[PDB]
């Protein structure tokens, strides 16, 4: 007590969700003409890395991208000329995430050392330097993104999300409603709220200004591994190890599409959306990512790479290209 | 020709490429080891016998070899994750106890964890060195109160090399995969001989690999 009150509240909220609407997204959109098969080919081959890579990010203007490797090196690639703008050596070899700020001044990177530090790219000395080392968490970092020029949001294995501040160098907020290891987060196009996953098959939406979650969707089976919004910010479709991709609506507050295929039984490492919100890319294991139609929920052309094994993929702001990175130290640009 | 500044940019790119390749070839000669244990293991003994809230890295030189030892004890998350980060590791080191068998049992859980980590998907072609710590400690414990164990059907002799040999054979079991050898050694944590056996194990692993290329194996 009052555990029975909690379970009856869960039952009544489930009944309300069931009775909210009669929509099923199956009788509708079936008559809408689907898009044809989509074919992609490799257009660039970034072969400057030497070991496993985990995550990468696209900078603003869709020409510069950043990637991280187990060799403890950050490379600021150039999409067009395939030259390397910078080569930042890191203090800690183990790295699990790297993010590029909206302005090219700063870049964040972190890993198992419980710290995702900041590096400056524009200075009089003309060389990269340590800007700030931020140590607030205890568990391993997952991903810290930039919400402003001097404000970042972190995700650590200690089941906390903090939303650090650069100049002060101290935590200004904390989120502790997951009760499970977080894995990814993606800020919405609007800069007042975001969402983050957890290892207990639950995704929770947090408010930037306020301190508590709002919805706490729990409509998944096994785990959560990647979350990413699409414009207008109402889907943040996610994938997991259960070979299932699902998208949730904040207002609907109920499962909508729950993509699934019987042939494939694998995991998911990263998920991204397109510019128009029609095609969503998801990198599976088995070493070959896939593309899925947002509306018709059918399957399009399989992708070739990589050798071993696809781990991250990102889509530029203009959508002119997609970057994919795999453990074989190969970054490929596909159009 | 393409332009003026782009030629300089390409030259800088080649220069940093050469620097990166040199750094990588320099860093590819060292050997890395992963130390994993359990509750009340010999972490302190191994750390002190080498000669903040995160993973500890210890690098030391012994006979023209730069050993890089990584131990993960401060992490509180599930070991099923982040374990793939150490896929490319030369060898791992395990410590058991001996004489932990009737306390919050200990050897049963340690053996279960060892079997679980020895039979996972992507971590198979990696050698495991296993240490028999507290060698002098369990003699009096087995002498005073034999034997027993809560692990039944032992049906063997009493003291004392027999029990150690039986435990070593039991731990050497569960190696379903072929072409993978598990090394065992017992230390009193008194003298300084662990470095020598680690070096011998490492050179044996290196020989088994190169020999592998001709394969041939």
């Amino acid at each position, epitope marked *: 007590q009052l555990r029975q009150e909690a379970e009856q509240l869960k039952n009544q909220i489930r009944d309300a969700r069931k009775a909210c609407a009669d929509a099923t997204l199956s009788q509708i959109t079936n008559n809408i003409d689907p898009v044809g098969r989509i074919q992609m080919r490799t257009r660039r081959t970034l072969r400057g890395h030497l070991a496993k890579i985990y995550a990468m990010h696209w900078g603003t203007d869709s020409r510069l991208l950043v990637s991280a490797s187990q060799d403890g090196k950050l490379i600021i690639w150039d999409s067009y000329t395939t030259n390397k703008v910078h080569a930042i050596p890191l203090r800690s070899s183990w790295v699990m995430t790297c993010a590029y700020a909206p302005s090219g001044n700063y870049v964040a990177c972190g890993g198992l050392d419980n710290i995702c530090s900041i590096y400056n790219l524009k200075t009089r000395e003309g060389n990269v330097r340590v800007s700030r080392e931020l140590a607030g968490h205890t568990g391993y970092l997952s991903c810290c993104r930039f919400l402003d020029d001097n404000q970042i949001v972190t995700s650590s294995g200690d089941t906390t999300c903090a939303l650090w501040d650069i100049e002060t160098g101290q935590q200004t907020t904390t989120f502790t409603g997951h009760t499970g290891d977080v894995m990814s987060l993606s800020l919405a196009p609007d800069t007042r709220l975001f969402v983050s996953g957890a290892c207990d098959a639950s995704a929770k939406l947090w408010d930037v200004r306020e301190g508590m979650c709002r919805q706490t969707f729990t409509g998944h089976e096994s785990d959560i591994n990647a979350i990413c919004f699409f414009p207008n910010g109402n889907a943040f479709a996610t994938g997991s190890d259960d070979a299932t991709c699902r998208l949730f609506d904040l207002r609907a507050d109920q499962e909508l599409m729950t993509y699934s295929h019987d042939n494939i039984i694998c995991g998911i490492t990263s998920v991204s959306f397109s510019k128009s919100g029609r095609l969503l890319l998801a990198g599976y294991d088995d070493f070959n990512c896939n593309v899925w139609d947002a509306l018709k929920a059918d399957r399009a052309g399989v992708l070739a790479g990589h050798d071993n094994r696809v781990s991250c993929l990102g889509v530029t702001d203009d959508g002119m290209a997609v970057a994919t990175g795999s453990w074989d130290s190969f970054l490929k640009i596909w159009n | 020709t393409l332009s*003026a500044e782009e030629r300089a940019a390409l030259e800088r790119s080649k220069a940093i490429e050469k620097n990166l390749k040199e750094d990588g070839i320099s860093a590819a000669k060292d050997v890395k080891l992963l130390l994993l244990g359990a509750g009340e293991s010999g972490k302190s003994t191994i750390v002190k016998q080498m000669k903040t809230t995160g993973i500890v890295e210890t690098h030391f030189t012994f006979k023209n070899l730069h050993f890089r030892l990584f131990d993960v004890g401060g992490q509180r998350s599930e070991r099923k994750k982040w374990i793939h980060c150490f896929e490319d590791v030369t060898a791992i080191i395990f410590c058991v106890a001996l004489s932990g068998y009737d306390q919050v049992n200990r050897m049963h859980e340690s053996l279960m964890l060892f079997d679980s980590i020895c039979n996972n998907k992507f971590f198979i072609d990696t050698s495991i060195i296993l240490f028999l710590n507290k060698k002098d400690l369990f003699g009096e414990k087995i002498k005073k109160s034999p034997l027993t164990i809560c692990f039944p059907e032992y049906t063997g002799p009493n003291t004392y090399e027999d029990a150690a040999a039986y435990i070593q054979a039991q731990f050497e079991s569960k190696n379903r995969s072929p072409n993978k050898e598990i090394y065992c050694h017992m230390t009193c944590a008194t003298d300084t001989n662990n470095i020598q056996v680690v070096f011998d194990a490492v050179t044996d692993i290196i020989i088994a690999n190169n020999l592998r290329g001709c394969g041939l194996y």
Partner: single-chain antibody, 233 residues
């Protein structure tokens, strides 16, 4: 902070030898490329030599090749230049300039303090008129004409601008004739087609009175034009 210091000037008999050396301490000298700039005793500017960051690429001017040599010593953060068989026309005052080349760079941003040495086809640019009567608080525009179109197929226009205060080392204003260098007020602005280039200065005040220079970086050799100076009528 960044600061370039050199001291190699003096009275030299014609047909002599001399060494010029400039030292950098305010940044990473090993990762930058050095330029040498000559300033005629009255108004002129002329390019001399360039050495890359890796010292694997060397260029020279038409009137400089075969007489002068350039080198740099990376551990000591120093640049060396050799004057050999110098002639009467070589009397001038010299600059050594830092430059880095990558995407979104600002080369020729910082210029050092010069030293004076006394004695005893190619793209051309034109400016006019060298004398413009202007008053503070009124907008002014300065244009310079180039021979060949600067619009490369990459969508970039390799043109740079410089301002020289009376009695002080020149500093960069605009790079690639479309961006704005750091430490420059927003009042400055410059634009043009692939051939003609013109600034757009708004709310001019009583300190931006130095002579203006426009330079081309499309291909070697780099050439400067005859600048135009303002006044306080």
């Amino acid at each position: 902070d960044v600061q370039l210091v050199e001291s190699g000037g003096g009275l030299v008999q014609p047909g002599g030898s001399r060494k010029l050396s400039c030292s950098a301490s305010g940044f990473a000298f090993s990762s930058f490329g050095m330029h040498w700039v000559r300033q005629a005793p009255e108004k002129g500017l002329e390019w001399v030599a360039y050495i890359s960051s890796g010292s694997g690429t060397i260029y020279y001017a038409d009137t400089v090749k075969g007489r002068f040599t350039i080198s740099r010593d990376d551990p000591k953060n120093t640049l060396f230049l050799q004057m050999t068989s110098l002639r009467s026309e070589d009397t001038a005052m010299y600059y050594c300039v830092r430059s880095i080349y990558y995407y979104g760079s600002s080369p020729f941003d910082f210029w050092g303090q010069g030293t004076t040495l006394t004695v005893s086809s190619d793209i051309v640019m034109t400016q006019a008129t060298s004398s413009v009567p202007v008053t503070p608080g009124e907008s002014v525009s300065i244009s310079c004409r180039s021979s060949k179109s600067l619009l490369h197929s990459n969508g970039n226009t390799y043109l740079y601008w410089f301002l020289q205060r009376p009695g002080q080392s020149p500093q960069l204003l605009i790079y690639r004739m479309s961006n704005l260098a750091s430490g420059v007020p927003d009042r400055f602005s410059g634009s043009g087609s692939g051939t003609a280039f013109t600034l757009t200065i708004s709310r001019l005040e009583a300190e931006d009175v130095g002579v203006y220079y426009c330079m081309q970086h499309l291909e070697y050799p780099l050439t400067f034009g005859a600048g135009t100076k303002l006044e306080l009528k």
